[PDB]
Amino acid sequence: PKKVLTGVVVSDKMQKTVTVLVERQFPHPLYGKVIKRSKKYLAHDPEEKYKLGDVVEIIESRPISKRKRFRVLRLVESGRMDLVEKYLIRRQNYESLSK
Amino acid sequence: GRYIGPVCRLCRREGVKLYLKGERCYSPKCAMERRPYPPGQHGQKRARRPSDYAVRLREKQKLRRIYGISERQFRNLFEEASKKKGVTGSVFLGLLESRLDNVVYRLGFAVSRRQARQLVRHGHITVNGRRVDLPSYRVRPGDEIAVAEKSRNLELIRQNLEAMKGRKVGPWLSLDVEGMKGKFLRLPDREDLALPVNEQLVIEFYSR
Amino acid sequence: AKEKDTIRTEGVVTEALPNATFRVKLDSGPEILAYISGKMRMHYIRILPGDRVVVEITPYDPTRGRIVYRK
Amino acid sequence: MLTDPIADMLTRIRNATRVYKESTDVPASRFKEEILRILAREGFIKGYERVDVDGKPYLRVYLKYGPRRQGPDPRPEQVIHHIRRISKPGRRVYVGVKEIPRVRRGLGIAILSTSKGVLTDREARKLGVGGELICEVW
Amino acid sequence: MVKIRLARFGSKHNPHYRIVVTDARRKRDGKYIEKIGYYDPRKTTPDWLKVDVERARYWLSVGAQPTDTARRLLRQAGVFRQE
Amino acid sequence: PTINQLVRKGREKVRKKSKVPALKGAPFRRGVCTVVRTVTPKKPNSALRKVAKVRLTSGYEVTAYIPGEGHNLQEHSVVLIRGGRVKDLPGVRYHIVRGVYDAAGVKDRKKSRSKYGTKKPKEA
RNA sequence: AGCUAGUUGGUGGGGUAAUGGCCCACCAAGGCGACGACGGGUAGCCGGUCUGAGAGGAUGGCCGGCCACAGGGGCACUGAGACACGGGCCCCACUCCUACGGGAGGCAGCAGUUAGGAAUCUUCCGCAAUGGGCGCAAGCCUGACGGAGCGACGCCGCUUGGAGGAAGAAGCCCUUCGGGGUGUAAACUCCUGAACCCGGGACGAAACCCCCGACGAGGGGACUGACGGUACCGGGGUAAUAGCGCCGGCCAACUCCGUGCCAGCAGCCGCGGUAAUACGGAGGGCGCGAGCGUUACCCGGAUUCACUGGGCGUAAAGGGCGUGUAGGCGGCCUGGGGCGUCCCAUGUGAAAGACCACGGCUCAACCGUGGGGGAGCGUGGGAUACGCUCAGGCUAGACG
Ligand SMILES: [Mg+2]
Ligand SMILES: [Mg+2]
Ligand SMILES: [Mg+2]
Ligand SMILES: [Mg+2]
Ligand SMILES: [Mg+2]
Ligand SMILES: [Mg+2]
Ligand SMILES: [Mg+2]
Ligand SMILES: [Mg+2]
Ligand SMILES: [Mg+2]
Ligand SMILES: [Mg+2]
Ligand SMILES: [Mg+2]
Ligand SMILES: [Mg+2]
Ligand SMILES: [Mg+2]
Ligand SMILES: [Mg+2]
Ligand SMILES: [Mg+2]
Ligand SMILES: [Mg+2]
Ligand SMILES: [Mg+2]
Ligand SMILES: [Mg+2]
Ligand SMILES: [Mg+2]
Ligand SMILES: [Mg+2]
Ligand SMILES: [Mg+2]
Ligand SMILES: [Mg+2]
Ligand SMILES: [Mg+2]
Ligand SMILES: [Mg+2]
Ligand SMILES: [Mg+2]
Ligand SMILES: [Mg+2]
Ligand SMILES: [Mg+2]
Ligand SMILES: [Mg+2]
Ligand SMILES: [Mg+2]
Ligand SMILES: [Mg+2]
Ligand SMILES: [Mg+2]
Ligand SMILES: [Mg+2]
Ligand SMILES: [Mg+2]
Ligand SMILES: [Mg+2]
Ligand SMILES: [Mg+2]
Ligand SMILES: [Mg+2]
Ligand SMILES: [Mg+2]
Ligand SMILES: [Mg+2]
Ligand SMILES: [Mg+2]
Ligand SMILES: [Mg+2]
Ligand SMILES: [Mg+2]
Ligand SMILES: [Mg+2]
Ligand SMILES: [Mg+2]
Ligand SMILES: [Mg+2]
Ligand SMILES: [Mg+2]
Ligand SMILES: [Mg+2]
Ligand SMILES: [Mg+2]
Ligand SMILES: [Mg+2]
Ligand SMILES: [Mg+2]
């Protein structure tokens, strides 16, 4: 099957593209305690149909760019910006820890 | 290869008869009946309480001495036994017994285990009608050990058979004295053997 | 093998280094840091500069002597 | 924060047994009740009633004890000699049916939360289902 | 051209083969597609060759090509035999 | 350390600090001597414990210890180090294995021979 | 600790077998980052191998898979497939010849040389096998492979005899002077015959090929062995290599003399400074044995990085305290979804290995056949306690 992922649209800032953010709650091989790691996926958005904070289902496609390999297959729930919010705050935080 | 040397010394050391002579060791000469102390310059000297390790080691030596095997071979056998299902201790001993030379000694074709080995290695021994000259050679159950036809007429073997004529083999074995055959019928056990060893100790030793 | 080789020459105690080591100037010449003998140490035999002491010296390195006898 | 319920309950039980309190008391829960049932049937307790302590649903847990024993250390031989949460929050523990713990080589038990319910290790093996391994008791 | 052929195994002076279907461009001992038979030339065993016939037939059908020795072996254990 | 802590940081895998830098993790290095000198041992041993500064095929310049009584070891002696810090002499981490190149068998040792490179004596 | 400007996304095009910033033109200004980007160091990666009870830790030699690279760096061309180890162009570095303009090279193919190194093989035979390429076939190649050589480099098997034989020869050693020890060990008698010699002699090789049969099935024929005159078999037939470590404790095994904190030993502790069971020898003993040791490395022991399985008053260890962001974590009841979780089914988990069983080498190592197991991941269905999530309610926590 084509790999199906579930994630929240953390960004729309490129034409016909969404930065989707997929959580993946996997148990940690050595210790066991189930980690909640997350990855950004850049996803082809044919229309700019999908706005920020949309939780979408994403499918691997032929390439349509260096680090953009996914059709947005379908929407699940929309508008849950809370989920975009945490991510955004994390991103912001970095600005601190430097020199 | 062999131990290849002074034997009743070994008997003296392990503090117990080990019968690596077969005839003399039976007689009033095993240097246990006449004398019985660990050899060399510190013989009659006080025997201080040995370590736990020490005892185990001595037991292993005893066992090894009895079956006349290069330590490596012994170790391999032990390992095999351990790998094998069934009680390692007993199974190990069974495996040891299974040795062709040892079987021959036990069947009686030769009086001494060394002698048996020698007999095997010259080609006087024949499993299942074939020259099986390998002292190592573990025999499976249901296998007929026989003196080779060309070795039946030879005097030593005849003498041994005569000695063994009437007097019993092992419970695990069968011997036909006339045709010089002898079937390794079942596989042996622990109670089936008179051994001065406590194979548990051997196991422990190997475990370390 | 244990080689009999050493030179049993005497010397003036020049200077006390640590441990019980001394730069002692011999009968013949060169000053070598010479450490005190074990025997001497055992019998507590002190040395100070301004002494004349027996100093056994090696063939391998005639630079490290050994102060043998109690002065 | 009271930050585990199940573990706390287990710990409460343990503490009450350590000083031979006839009956402990632990705030009620479905899961806790289930656990107690499993314990009860296995026999680590006399059983539980469910009282209302000061307004709130609470389970008395009637702790079983071995007989008053002769000699120095007159201390009634505990039946729950030791009790241990295994899947705690943080490190949660899920074991396949093959991986299900044989606690004390059979003697005491391991409580397993399964899709089939809370049930002893034995039960889990019988039904052939693993689950989240709650705790062991012996 | 996926061949049916004899992958050498065993040891020194202990030659053994597997009647094995592989792409021609391989280490003769290399990762083959299917082990469809085995064969001992030294004929030590009573079962000195055993080829699975159906699988071999299938391989032949897709156009696997048996190497001369392999072909011979197949013939011996009736794969080309038409009744 | 809480399991979350472990996940974050893990365990610092204990790196085995190498006791001998003869290099390559090689069993022996043959170096050429510079100075066969003699050294005073540490606090509780007193001798004139022999030694040789050795300059190596591994570029390092280390003082190996000479075992056995005597030595045809000189100055420009091509010699094989063995590795194995000797307790007494401070900062001497090696040996000279005897019975190779310039170093020769400790003469007329009858007992522990293979360790001193002394060829079996021809018994009459 | 920030990195990035073909960098990120778009449109358009080029290029490609094909997607694509792969590349370009033009916009838009992103994209990644402490869930550790970039930088540095290091390194082929894996099936496996070792080790470990296991979890794990190391490691990736050999055999199998994949990559990369064929002096260093570009680059294409040809082709089904390469940017091409024994094809091409170019630059560079090196060696090689040059009539000085110029060309010739490429062993990380086998073998060998030399260097470096502690250290690593024969300028071997063969196409008989199996595989490759070509060709109708014959056949030709084939340093793939098959074998032989050398190396105790490992593993396994075997030999250096066996039976008897003193109340104990000699020699050597201790002694308390009687004796003890070495030791049935030897000597010696009988036996058996590794070696060695003679006779025989493989299996591995039946196809390809030819004829009959249709050049099909199928049947018959004929040829062919590097190893190798080897293995092995039959006869013949002599008693026919033992060594190395250790002997204070850990650790199996002690006495004497030499020696005097010296010469030495040492893995740690530590022996030696005139009775050394620790040094050197001697006897004796213990361990292993065609080996035995040392070195180096790995794991183990080390629950000494502790997930299993440690700790933090005083031993190393609680931040000087707040307040907080990220994260981690989370009370009680009901309902759904079922992501985690569990189960079942099947797909995958190559081969070899490792596990088991049998089989073949006179045994074994080694190998073959057959079985099973398998962490993981895929898909279909299911389960709902837990965790998750969404919805609703509750008051024990929290705040008011
Ligand atoms: Mg051997
Ligand atoms: Mg020594
Ligand atoms: Mg395009
Ligand atoms: Mg790019
Ligand atoms: Mg541009
Ligand atoms: Mg680098
Ligand atoms: Mg590298
Ligand atoms: Mg690695
Ligand atoms: Mg490989
Ligand atoms: Mg080169
Ligand atoms: Mg080039
Ligand atoms: Mg290049
Ligand atoms: Mg090419
Ligand atoms: Mg090229
Ligand atoms: Mg390439
Ligand atoms: Mg080349
Ligand atoms: Mg080469
Ligand atoms: Mg050379
Ligand atoms: Mg060199
Ligand atoms: Mg070779
Ligand atoms: Mg040729
Ligand atoms: Mg061919
Ligand atoms: Mg022609
Ligand atoms: Mg040619
Ligand atoms: Mg070869
Ligand atoms: Mg060999
Ligand atoms: Mg060697
Ligand atoms: Mg004898
Ligand atoms: Mg004879
Ligand atoms: Mg011949
Ligand atoms: Mg002799
Ligand atoms: Mg001892
Ligand atoms: Mg010692
Ligand atoms: Mg001594
Ligand atoms: Mg070795
Ligand atoms: Mg550990
Ligand atoms: Mg812990
Ligand atoms: Mg601690
Ligand atoms: Mg402190
Ligand atoms: Mg504080
Ligand atoms: Mg706070
Ligand atoms: Mg928070
Ligand atoms: Mg909850
Ligand atoms: Mg939460
Ligand atoms: Mg497999
Ligand atoms: Mg297999
Ligand atoms: Mg067999
Ligand atoms: Mg709620
Ligand atoms: Mg208040």
From Swiss-Prot, chain B:
The alphabetized UniProt keywords are: Metal-binding, Ribonucleoprotein, Ribosomal protein, RNA-binding, rRNA-binding, Zinc
Span of domain S4 RNA-binding: 98-160
Return the SMART domains for the record: Ribosomal_S4, S4
* Binding-site list for Zn(2+): C8, C11, C25, C30
Q: Which PROSITE patterns match?
A: RIBOSOMAL_S4, S4
Record GO terms (molecular function): metal ion binding; rRNA binding; structural constituent of ribosome
The GO cellular component terms are: small ribosomal subunit
> What InterPro entries does this protein map onto?
Ribosomal_uS4 (IPR022801), Ribosomal_uS4_bac-type (IPR005709), Ribosomal_uS4_CS (IPR018079), Ribosomal_uS4_N (IPR001912), S4_RNA-bd (IPR002942), S4_RNA-bd_sf (IPR036986)
- Cofactor(s) for this protein? Zn(2+); [4Fe-4S] cluster
Q: Paste the cofactor note.
A: Binds 1 zinc ion per subunit. In a number of structures (e.g. 4Y4O, 5FDV) a 4Fe-4S cluster is seen in place of the zinc cofactor.
Superkingdom field: Bacteria
Biological-process GO terms, alphabetical: ribosomal small subunit biogenesis; translation
Fill in the subunit field for this protein: Part of the 30S ribosomal subunit. Contacts protein S5. The interaction surface between S4 and S5 is involved in control of translational fidelity.
Instruction: List the HAMAP family.
Output: Ribosomal_uS4_B (MF_01306_B)
Which family is this sequence assigned to?
Belongs to the universal ribosomal protein uS4 family.
Role? One of the primary rRNA binding proteins, it binds directly to 16S rRNA where it helps nucleate assembly of the body and platform of the 30S subunit. Binds mRNA in the 70S ribosome, positioning it for translation.
Protein name in the entry: Small ribosomal subunit protein uS4
Q: What is the native source organism of this protein? A: Thermus thermophilus (strain ATCC 27634 / DSM 579 / HB8)
Whichever gene encodes this chain, its name is rpsD
UniProtKB/Swiss-Prot annotation, chain C:
Question: What's a Pfam family in this record?
Answer: eIF-1a
**Which HAMAP family does the UniProt entry name for this protein?**
IF_1 (MF_00075)
The gene is: infA
Top-rank taxon, per record: Bacteria
- Into which family does the record put it? Belongs to the IF-1 family.
* Subunit field text: Binds to the 30S ribosomal subunit, contacting protein S12 and the 16S rRNA. Component of the 30S ribosomal translation pre-initiation complex which assembles on the 30S ribosome in the order IF-2 and IF-3, IF-1 and N-formylmethionyl-tRNA(fMet); mRNA recruitment can occur at any time during PIC assembly.
* NCBIfam families according to UniProt: infA
Q: Which InterPro entries match?
A: NA-bd_OB-fold, RNA-binding_domain_S1_IF1, TIF_IF1
Q: Name one GO molecular function term.
A: ribosome binding
GO CC annotation: what is one? cytosol
Q: Which PANTHER family match?
A: TRANSLATION INITIATION FACTOR IF-1, CHLOROPLASTIC
Q: Which residues form the S1-like domain?
A: 1-71
Task: Outline what the protein does.
Answer: One of the essential components for the initiation of protein synthesis. Binds in the vicinity of the A-site. Stabilizes the binding of IF-2 and IF-3 on the 30S subunit to which N-formylmethionyl-tRNA(fMet) subsequently binds. Helps modulate mRNA selection, yielding the 30S pre-initiation complex (PIC). Upon addition of the 50S ribosomal subunit IF-1, IF-2 and IF-3 are released leaving the mature 70S translation initiation complex.
Subcellular location(s) per record:
Cytoplasm
Location (main, coarse): cytoplasm
Does the record bear Cytoplasm in its keywords? yes
Give the UniProt keywords, A-Z: Cytoplasm, Initiation factor, Protein biosynthesis, RNA-binding, rRNA-binding
**The name this protein goes by in its record:** Translation initiation factor IF-1
From Swiss-Prot, chain D:
Could you tell me one molecular function GO term of this UniProt entry?
A: rRNA binding
Pfam families on file = Ribosomal_S8 (PF00410)
Q: Which GO terms describe its biological process?
A: translation
One cellular-component annotation, GO: ribosome
Q: Which UniProt keywords apply?
A: Ribonucleoprotein, Ribosomal protein, RNA-binding, rRNA-binding
Q: Which Gene3D superfamilies match?
A: 3.30.1370.30, 3.30.1490.10
Q: Quote the subunit structure annotation.
A: Part of the 30S ribosomal subunit. Contacts proteins S2, S5 and S12.
What is this protein's function per UniProt? One of the primary rRNA binding proteins, it binds directly to 16S rRNA where it helps nucleate assembly of the platform of the 30S subunit central domain. The combined cluster of proteins S8, S12 and S17 appears to hold together the shoulder and platform of the 30S subunit.
Q: Which HAMAP family match?
A: Ribosomal_uS8_B
Q: Which family does it belong to?
A: Belongs to the universal ribosomal protein uS8 family.
Protein's name according to its UniProt entry = Small ribosomal subunit protein uS8
**Gene of origin?**
rpsH
Curated annotation (Swiss-Prot), chain F:
Q: Which GO terms describe its biological process?
A: translation
Record's GO cellular component, any one?
small ribosomal subunit
The UniProt keywords, alphabetically, are:
Methylation, Ribonucleoprotein, Ribosomal protein, RNA-binding, rRNA-binding, tRNA-binding
Q: Cite a single Pfam family from the UniProt record.
A: Ribosom_S12_S23
Q: Does the keyword Cell cycle apply?
A: no
Kindly list the positions at which 3-methylthioaspartic acid occurs in this protein.
Answer: D88
Give positions of region: Disordered: 105-124
| Basic residues composition bias: residue spans | 108-119
Modified how: The methythiolated Asp-88 contacts a modifed residue of the 16S rRNA close to the decoding center, and might be important for decoding center assembly.
Q: Which residues form a coiled coil?
A: none
Query: GO MF terms on file?
Result: rRNA binding; structural constituent of ribosome; tRNA binding
| Oligomer status and interactors | Part of the 30S ribosomal subunit. Contacts proteins S8 and S17. Interacts with IF1 in the 30S initiation complex.
Which HAMAP family did the record assign? Ribosomal_uS12_B (MF_00403_B)
Q: Which family does it belong to?
A: Belongs to the universal ribosomal protein uS12 family.
Function per UniProt: With S4 and S5 plays an important role in translational accuracy.
The protein, known as: Small ribosomal subunit protein uS12
Q: Which gene encodes it?
A: rpsL
